[PDB]
Ligand binder design. Structure first.
Ligand code: HEM
Ligand code: HEM
Ligand SMILES: O=[N+]([O-])c1cccc2c(Br)n[nH]c12
Ligand SMILES: O=[N+]([O-])c1cccc2c(Br)n[nH]c12
Ligand SMILES: O=[N+]([O-])c1cccc2c(Br)n[nH]c12
Ligand SMILES: O=[N+]([O-])c1cccc2c(Br)n[nH]c12
Ligand SMILES: [Zn+2]
Lengths: 400, 400
């Protein structure tokens, strides 16, 4: 049967015919739903499917060129137990992987992704070079450009390339004596691993961490990111004069570097990607999450709000302002940034496009709906279907 | 094995063993997840499980009385195709149904539920008297008390007892010539059905609709709830003087009446229930949903906010204040009301209790997390498992 997807605001109805064609299986079963949980012959089966997707995307499916490519991949697998992608295929696969990310609300821009082929990378030093170049091209002095740099794939009889850091730009997390944490509590483990590997730690709340680059069958090397590459934005509020004084700030480039890029059976343990930040991710998750900076109560007290009772909605009021500050500070600094209203509205446009294009779109409601003002966005009143498609980006265990 | 549930704020882990006893299947499959979607041999099986549950609750499982009750239910079903519930079982079952509602965030009160057995009702006029006494009891002049009135179960040889209204108290929605709607847009269908059945409509924004009660195999009859029975609250803001002048208001008693009560294979098409309001439902959903009262833009303008650009976060700001107005207003009028922070905090408590009690708890993440400031609440960072347990409340097709 075809899942009926309804929008409860407008009453519109569509059918997801793309979900049937979904390969791998998820954690859900007819018995119980786990959708809220954060976490040889086979290879050939996936590769044949990917090649088909590619030739189908250039309207040449069933061609002699299509068959030649299919037979070529099989032969490679028989003689090596693996195979290699053509540039045009990688570029296509990278874009598809993003297009398929169920939790990403910025997919309307999936086709404009710039793919940098770094499969010829020889070492960590060269890896660091690729990363720096990526950061320069992506940051572009404020006018951000979405991009991904694909490093050499996972090959039999050797270790793979890996970026130990969860993101290319992260803030240190120094575990304090009294039990607290100076800086970002989410970066504690990686911060200590940087220290043990020979990094001289600071003592600020926003210290940019070094990159722990790992090459095949080799221990990770520390690499310091030149401050001139790491563009940052000082936070301030349009009417709250004292806000600037809080010394808060955040980086311009959101770059995930710990996810695995899977294309046609092939695995690329290292392939950092980046686009641009959605305000709420900085103002609501990063700055207000309890297990993170937790600056909510501090700002509320400074705003002179009644923090004694929950009924005053001081938390809600303080959060909104922190988010307004992020948006304000980024526009003033002329760094790309999009509020949750514009992001969700565009995603609704993406659904409509994907419905015409593929007859559906894998989406994860819990992730598409922003962490604040949920029902104020169109995506809240829009039913969604979550499923795994390939090519795709996947989570992977830490290299340590 | 059993599902591993995790809280990302604290880091705690648990295993939902209760899910493994799900008496029915859901919409999700390993291929895809549909969690965000809003919508004789079998009889004996469900009935027996229910009776087993009841005897386990009063620590008399396996006793003679237990074995006799089972033979009795089996005998009645063999002779009539159905069976009669003992008063004590009805009370127990009703509580389990609320206890099993995956979408209810106020289930910590499932134990304190008043049950009105009305299985001896014979007419629409008698159905009306029951409901009025229900309202008078639940409202309790402001200090609301949870309640549920159970009407005659579904019989094989006759129609069902139904309550056409989705709630015992709702505001009329009048379609205007200019395409607009005066009143609650969500109530247009039931509003027109009352008119079609002999009721002369009003012309206000908050007209309390008449009850459309239906007796077995008979056309529905109109019934007007005496004004003195419907406790309403005028909406005003603590500092925004102009808010009160908007003439906004909302009823005190939220009583779902269009759902079916399922107990031991027995169906109760009519069994209205009620508790008290969670501010967000009124302040965010009823008043701010684009397809509802849609007061947001007007409130923002009065707030002297800049609605020309989304980044100003005028939508979020106006929403927070509207929600503050609801809370302030109910407290002023001394009508029971709970904010999303106090509610979510009590739900986490309910989880801990259910873990020790039954070893788990069915929950729908999308419904538990409030429509605003989602991540500011504890339930957001709490993973959940959704499954169907019985006794339970289920959706059913409209009587017309
Ligand atoms: C155009 C700018 C973009 C915006 C505004 C955007 C926004 C978001 C948001 C709000 C989330 C959910 C929260 C989170 O997971 O941290 C997310 C997740 C995700 N996005 Fe996008 N994104 C953008 C570009 C990209 C690009 C270029 C890719 C891939 C090539 C991508 C891949 C993903 C993936 C894989 C996730 C889930 C992994 C994770 O938890 O971090 N995004 N994005
Ligand atoms: C004590 C006060 C209560 C509060 C604060 C509360 C709050 C909520 C909220 C916020 C929802 C989600 C909104 C919605 O689905 O419309 C909900 C849903 C639900 N509640 Fe509760 N609730 C309360 C009492 C009750 C009682 C007394 C029962 C049953 C005896 C109950 C049964 C349900 C059910 C079945 C749902 C799903 C409703 C639906 O289908 O829309 N609730 N509740
Ligand atoms: O903006 N965001 O919230 C966000 C979250 C997670 C990943 C990315 C990327 Br890549 N660009 N922006 C992101
Ligand atoms: O998923 N949805 O389409 C959807 C629409 C309207 C309300 C809700 C709630 Br509450 N959870 N999910 C919803
Ligand atoms: O308080 N609420 O938001 C709410 C929503 C939906 C149903 C009920 C009942 Br029954 N009591 N309170 C409710
Ligand atoms: O923590 N959680 O259980 C959880 C469930 C569903 C979505 C999210 C997001 Br986005 N952050 N945390 C989540
Ligand atoms: Zn599911």
């Amino acid at each position: 049967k075809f899942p009926r997807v309804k929008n409860w605001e407008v009453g519109s109805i569509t059918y997801d015919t793309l979900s049937a064609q979904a390969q791998q299986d998820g954690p859900c079963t007819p018995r119980r739903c786990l959708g809220s949980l954060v976490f040889p012959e086979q290879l050939l089966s996936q590769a044949r499917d990917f090649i088909n997707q590619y030739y189908s995307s250039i309207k040449r499916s069933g061609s002699q060129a299509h068959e030649q490519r299919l037979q070529e991949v099989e032969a490679e697998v028989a003689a090596t137990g693996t195979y290699q992608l053509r540039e045009s295929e990688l570029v296509f696969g990278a874009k598809q992987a993003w297009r398929n990310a169920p939790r990403c609300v910025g997919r309307i821009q999936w086709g404009k992704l710039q793919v940098f082929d770094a499969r010829d990378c020889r070492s960590a030093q060269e890896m660091f070079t690729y990363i720096c170049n990526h950061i320069k091209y992506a940051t572009n002095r404020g006018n951000l450009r979405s991009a991904i740099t694909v490093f050499p794939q996972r090959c039999p009889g050797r270790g793979d390339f890996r970026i130990w850091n969860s993101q290319l730009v992260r803030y240190a997390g120094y575990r304090q004596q009294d039990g607290s944490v100076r800086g970002d509590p989410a970066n504690v483990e990686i911060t200590e691993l940087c220290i043990q590997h020979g990094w001289t730690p600071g003592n600020g709340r926003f210290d940019v961490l070094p990159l722990l680059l790992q090459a095949p069958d080799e221990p990770p090397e520390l690499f310091l990111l030149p401050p001139e590459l790491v563009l940052e934005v000082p936070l301030e509020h349009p009417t709250l004069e004292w806000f600037a004084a809080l010394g808060l700030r955040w980086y311009a480039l959101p770059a995930v570097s710990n996810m695995l890029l899977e294309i046609g059976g092939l695995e690329f343990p290292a392939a950092p990607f980046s686009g641009w930040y959605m305000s709420t991710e900085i103002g609501t998750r990063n700055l207000c999450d309890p297990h993170r900076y937790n600056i909510l109560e501090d700002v509320a007290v400074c705003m002179d709000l009644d923090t004694r009772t929950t009924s005053s909605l001081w938390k809600d009021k303080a959060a909104v302002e922190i988010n307004v500050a992020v948006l304000h500070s980024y526009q003033l600094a002329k760094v790309t940034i999009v509020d949750h209203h514009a992001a969700t509205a565009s995603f609704m446009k993406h659904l409509e496009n994907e419905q015409k294009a593929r007859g559906g779109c894998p989406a994860d409601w819990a992730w598409i709906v922003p962490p604040i003002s949920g029902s104020l966005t169109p995506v809240f009143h829009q039913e969604m279907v979550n499923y795994f498609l390939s090519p795709a980006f996947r989570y992977q265990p830490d290299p340590w």
